[PDB]
Amino acid sequence: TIKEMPQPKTFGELKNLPLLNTDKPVQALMKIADELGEIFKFEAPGRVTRYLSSQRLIKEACDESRFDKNLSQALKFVRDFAGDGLFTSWTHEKNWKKAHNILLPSFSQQAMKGYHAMMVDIAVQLVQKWERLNADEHIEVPEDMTRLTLDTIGLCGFNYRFNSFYRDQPHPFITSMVRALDEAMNKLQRANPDDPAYDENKRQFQEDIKVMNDLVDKIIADRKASGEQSDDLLTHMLNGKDPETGEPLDDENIRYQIITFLIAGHETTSGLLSFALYFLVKNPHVLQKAAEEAARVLVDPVPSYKQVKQLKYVGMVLNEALRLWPTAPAFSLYAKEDTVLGGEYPLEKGDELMVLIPQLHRDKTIWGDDVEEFRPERFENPSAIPQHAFKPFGNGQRACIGQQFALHEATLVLGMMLKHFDFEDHTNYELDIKETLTLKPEGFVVKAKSKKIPLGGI
Ligand code: HEM
Ligand SMILES: CCCCCCCCCCCCCCCC(=O)N[C@@H](CCSC)C(=O)O
Helix, strand or coil: CCCCCCCCCCCHHHCCHHHHCCCCHHHHHHHHHHHHCCEEEEEECCEEEEEECCHHHHHHHCCCCCEEEECCHHHHHHHHHHCCCCCCCCCCCHHHHHHHHHHHHHHCHHHHHHHHHHHHHHHHHHHHHHHCCCCCCCEEHHHHHHHHHHHHHHHHHHCCCCCHHHCCCCCHHHHHHHHHHHHHHHHCCCCCCCCHHHHHHHHHHHHHHHHHHHHHHHHHHHHHCCCCCCCCHHHHHHHCECCCCCCECCHHHHHHHHHHHHHHCCHHHHHHHHHHHHHHHHCHHHHHHHHHHHHHHCCCCCCCHHHHHCCHHHHHHHHHHHHHCCCCCEEEEEECCCEEECCCEEECCCCEEEEEHHHHCCCCCCCCCCCCCCCHHHHCCHHHCCCCCCCCCCCHHHCCCCHHHHHHHHHHHHHHHHHHEEEECCCCCCCCEEEECEEEECCCEEEEEECCCCCCCC
16 A cells, blocks of 8 residues: 655755755745655655655645654754744743743734834835836836835834835845845855855854844844833843743743744745736736725725725735645644555655645636636635645744734735726736745836825825
């Protein structure tokens, strides 16, 4: 009953490692999955993992009694700067559950209602920037989505203004973050990471980590010097006590959580918004539907929290963009004990699995055969989608803690974008997906023609 697992091409003693010697590893793995199927083994010197792409096997991988979150080599490298923050901690480390309990309240509905005004502050800056462009100009989409998302997590979470719209170059934190993520991605295929040919990479990596930490220093210092009372994410990080242990986070872990939330709290949302706008311009009828909803629902100068919740179709458009291009494209698991996967693949305690989310989301046995079409209507009734078929936010207790924050922000902004402008894919842009562990279109530009609808203050 046991089956021999397919495996891609090898390179002698380097096994499959050289297949990751590309600037687009996830896309390369997706192609391999298309060739090999629902599961394939991937070996590197001294290690092995198994890539899953079907809902039938992934539903098993998501059974928390059998599998727990694993730190992929990618996350082990990110941990060099994110430490035991929530994204890069093992479930069994004391600081995971402790920080989880202390920070969960920062993402409650009450908390979301409280972040709304600040999300509008940054959204208005984005709309004003576009309203102020001259006729001969265009929009660099992912660049501006990154300005928006970093500023939103900075303001809502830390009462800190990155003021990204006041810069024509990326904010310094972004430059160093991108370089650090790129280095972790690039280090995946190094068979000999310690060879002196990598000393410059190591030196630059440390410099980038320093830039991120100097920023964290300013955020912590600005909060101390604040005379105003805040009750945001940072307030809970600094003062919250875990109800289980009764203990608050220590300084070292707090610094890791700030770095973690500044990165996880914006990068993937900037990817989502970029991919959603890309699909909208490539599917005119869908853009028309979304724009009609935005005009019909957003009747006030600025959106209210309830109005954003009423943007159902915009929400569907965002979920369909997450289906095709989940911006944190994979997550890893390890077998808690010996177990047999899908009744054919025996695994030993400790064996690892990688869930290739874009492939899961293209499982024709779940969705129809039309998996490559952008059809928001697939999500008219999210509750009807089979369990574990759609997982852009991970799984179980280790799922995304900021899912509702991301979706609220993206729905708000995309709704405002669609209410205020008509968009044009003026260059007939060819999708080019840049990988920095996370995924984001590169070089995507559009032209926006204002509908000249006044924007309320605030
Ligand atoms: C559409 C945008 C987003 C996507 C696609 C996304 C996706 C994910 C995924 C797939 C995981 C699980 C990773 C794994 O198992 O290795 C995760 C974890 C996490 N995300 Fe998000 N995320 C998004 C936005 C956000 C935002 C806006 C925040 C902060 C406000 C955030 C904070 C976190 C944290 C802290 C974790 C780790 C949770 C834990 O294990 O306790 N995410 N996210
Ligand atoms: C604290 C903030 C953290 C932000 C990090 C966000 C990460 C999102 C994850 C993207 C997934 C990375 C996928 C990388 C490709 C891959 O399959 N790597 C595998 C290769 C195994 S063979 C040596 C791995 O990393 O183990």
